[PDB]
Structure 1
Amino acid sequence: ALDKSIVVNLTSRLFADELAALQSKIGSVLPLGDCHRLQNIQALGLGCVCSRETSPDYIQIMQYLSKCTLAVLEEVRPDSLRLTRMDPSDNLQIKNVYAPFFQWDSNTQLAVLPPLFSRKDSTIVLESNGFDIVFPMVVPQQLGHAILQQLLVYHIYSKISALDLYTTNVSFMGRTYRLDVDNTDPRTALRVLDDLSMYLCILSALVPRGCLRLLTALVRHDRHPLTEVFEGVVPDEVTRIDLDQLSVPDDITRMRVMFSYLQSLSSIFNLGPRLHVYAYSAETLAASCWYSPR
C-alpha cells in the first residue's frame, strides 16, 4: 500500500527556545504547499497568506485552506521537522493540543479554521531562519459555523460605521470569546457578502404567504421558547404581505424554489475540509478519524 511522510530540510540549527514550543505541540495539524517528501520550511507555514506586515483577511486565509494538502507532525528533531500526511480517505490518529481548549468525545465532528482568537498564541516565530509558522485551529462544526457567522456579521457592521460587544463576540453554551480583529482586509470578506445580497433578496421575492400568515397567528399570543426574537410584537412588514388570499398550488411552486436555493447556501457557508471522528480517547487526547475533502 501507500506511504505518506514529509521530512522537512532546514538550513539552520534551531535554538532551545523554539524547540520547546514545537515539542509541546507535537501532534498538530498544519497545511503545506507541495506533495513531496523533501520540502522547504517556507511552505509549512500558513504564514504565506497570513503575515505580520500585510493585513490578513481571514476569509481569504480560509479560502486558501481548502486548496492545500494538510499534515500532522511526528517528530521535531533539532535540524529537520518530520511530518505525516493526510489523504482521502484514510483513518489517522489526531491529537488536539489546541490552546482555546474544547472537549470532544466519540462520534464527534470537526473542521479546520484559521487562528481567530489569539494570533500571538497560535503563531510561533522562528528568528533562526526568519520565517514564521502559523498553526491553524480545528473546531467542531457547531462552533466551526458560529465563528464564520459572527465574522460575516462583523464586516456588515464595520462598513455601516463609515460597538464591539455585539459584533466581535462568539457565543456558546457556557463560554464567550473574542474574535481577533485589529487589521483585517474586508474586501475578500465582502465578495462573500456581495453574493449574500444576491441570494437573500431572491429569497425575499418567493416568500410563501401561508408561512407569513402562520406567524401572524403565532407570535401574537401563542408564545414559544424559540420565537423570543420578535419579543411579542409583529414586524411592520409581515402585516403588509398577507393581504392576498391563500391558495395551495401557488405556494407549491414557491416552496420548491425556496427548497432549491437553500441548497445553494451550502456554497457560501462552506467550512474547509471536514473530519469525521469515530473514536476519541479522553485522558490521552488522541482520536481516530477519516479525512474527507469537500
Structure 2
Amino acid sequence: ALDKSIVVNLTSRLFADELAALQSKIGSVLPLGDCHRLQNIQALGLGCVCSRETSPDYIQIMQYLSKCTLAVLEEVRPDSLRLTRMDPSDNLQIKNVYAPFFQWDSNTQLAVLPPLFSRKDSTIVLESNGFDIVFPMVVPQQLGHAILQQLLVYHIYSKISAGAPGDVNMAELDLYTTNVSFMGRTYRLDVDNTDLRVLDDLSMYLCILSALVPRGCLRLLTALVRHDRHPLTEVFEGVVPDEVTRIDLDQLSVPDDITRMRVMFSYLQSLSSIFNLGPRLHVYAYSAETLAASCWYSPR
C-alpha cells in the first residue's frame, strides 16, 4: 500500500566520465539525511560531515550513521538520481561494489562502517556540482569487528615509533597488522602510511581508559564491603594484577577523585556504543557470478 521512492535532483548536468563510475555501482547502500522523496545533493554521501578541509573523524561519523537513514540505488539517470528507501525489516536486493573487494557469503551479518581507507577507493567526486559523495565501507560484522582492531593497534605503534625509534620494529609491526585472516582466506589491506588520521580519537580514548581503569577499580572494590556483597566479586580479586592493588589513594584528593570517576564512566558509555550499535543488516542468499545479495535491514 505504502509507496517509497527517493528522487534526488541536481542543478547541473553530469559529465560523460562520471556517469560510468555511478553505473559501475548500480547497487549500493547510501546514507541519506532526510526521509522525504525530493532532496538536494548535500546529504546523500558523507560529505555533510566528513570533508577534506575539515579534520577526518571516526566517531562523529559513527554517531551519524546510526542516526541516518539508508537508501539503495536503482537507476542512474542524468541528472536525477533514483534511490530506493530502506524500511525497518524490509527485503530488498544489493549488489556489492566496494573497494577493496571483500568476499560476501550468505548467512553473514552486514555491518555498515565508515570508510577509513584511501580516497579513490571510497568516493566518487562529482565535478559538476563540486560536491563529494562518499560510499560507506560495508564489511561483514566479524571482519568489521576485526578490521578495525588491527589497524587501531597499528595506529598506536605508529605514535610510539614517531616519539622513540627503539621500541617498535617495523617488520614486526607490518607483518602482524596489515595481514588479516578470515574465513580461512587472507586480505592484505592498504596501509596508507605514505605520510591514519581517522582513528586518532579512538587511540586517545582507549589509552585514557588504560591508565584510569586500574586507578578506578581499586577504589570501587574497597568502597563496596558489605554483608550483602555479590559473591562473584570475591573471585575477581584474583584476576586484578598485584601491582594494581598497591596504589596509595591518599595521593589524589577527594575533589580530584570525583573528577576522575565521572571521567571514568563518561568515556565508557560513549566508547561502548560506537563499537556496538550501528545500522546493521542480514543477508540470506548470495551468488558469486551475479554478485547480488538479498538482504533485510534491522534497525538498532
TM-score bracket for the superposition, by shorter chain length: 0.5 to 0.7
Q: Compute the displacement of 1:152 (Å).
A: 3.8
CA distance in 2, matches of 1:159, 1:287: 40
Paired residue secondary structure (2:153): helix
- Please tell me whether the aligned partners of residues 125 and 133 of structure 2 are also in contact (alpha carbons under 8 angstroms): yes
Q: Compute the displacement of 1:211 (Å).
A: 18
CA distance in 2, matches of 1:37, 1:132: 21
Deviates more, 1:152-161 or 1:107-116: 152-161
In structure 1, the partner of 2:147 is 147
Deviates more, 1:105-114 or 1:2-11: 105-114
Q: Taking structure 1 as reference, are residues 195 and 251 closer, same or farther at Cα in structure 2, changes over 3 Å only? A: same
- Please tell me whether the aligned partners of residues 117 and 178 of structure 1 are also in contact (alpha carbons under 8 angstroms): no
Deviations 1:146-204 (A, max 9, x none): 1232344345445555x66656665546666576777999xxxx999999999999999
For structure 1, list consecutive stretches of 5 or more residues without a partner in the other structure.
Answer: none
- Please tell me whether the aligned partners of residues 111 and 271 of structure 1 are also in contact (alpha carbons under 8 angstroms): no
Q: Taking structure 1 as reference, are residues 204 and 58 closer, same or farther at Cα in structure 2, changes over 3 Å only? A: closer
Deviates more, 1:236-245 or 1:74-83: 236-245
Deviates more, 1:228-237 or 1:141-150: 228-237
Deviations 1:47-66 (A, max 9, x none): 11221122211232222111
Paired residue secondary structure (1:263): helix
TM-score, normalised with respect to structure 2: 0.67
- Please tell me whether the aligned partners of residues 6 and 37 of structure 2 are also in contact (alpha carbons under 8 angstroms): yes
- Please tell me whether the aligned partners of residues 7 and 81 of structure 1 are also in contact (alpha carbons under 8 angstroms): yes
- Please tell me whether the aligned partners of residues 8 and 82 of structure 1 are also in contact (alpha carbons under 8 angstroms): yes
CA distance in 2, matches of 1:242, 1:182: 44
Deviations 1:234-273 (A, max 9, x none): 9997999999999999999999999999999863521521
Number of residue pairs matched by the alignment: 289
TM-score, normalised with respect to structure 1: 0.68
For structure 2, list consecutive stretches of 5 or more residues without a partner in the other structure.
Answer: 162-172
- Please tell me whether the aligned partners of residues 34 and 69 of structure 1 are also in contact (alpha carbons under 8 angstroms): yes
Q: Taking structure 1 as reference, are residues 17 and 258 closer, same or farther at Cα in structure 2, changes over 3 Å only? A: closer
RMSD, aligned α-carbons: 8.4
Paired residue secondary structure (1:30): strand
- Please tell me whether the aligned partners of residues 116 and 198 of structure 2 are also in contact (alpha carbons under 8 angstroms): no
- Flag the structure with higher helix content: 2
Q: Taking structure 1 as reference, are residues 141 and 184 closer, same or farther at Cα in structure 2, changes over 3 Å only? A: farther
Deviations 1:103-162 (A, max 9, x none): 22322211111122332222111111110111112111111101232344345445555x
Q: What is the aligned-residue identity percentage?
A: 100
Deviations 1:189-240 (A, max 9, x none): x999999999999999999999999999999999999999999999997999
Q: Compute the displacement of 1:86 (Å).
A: 0.9
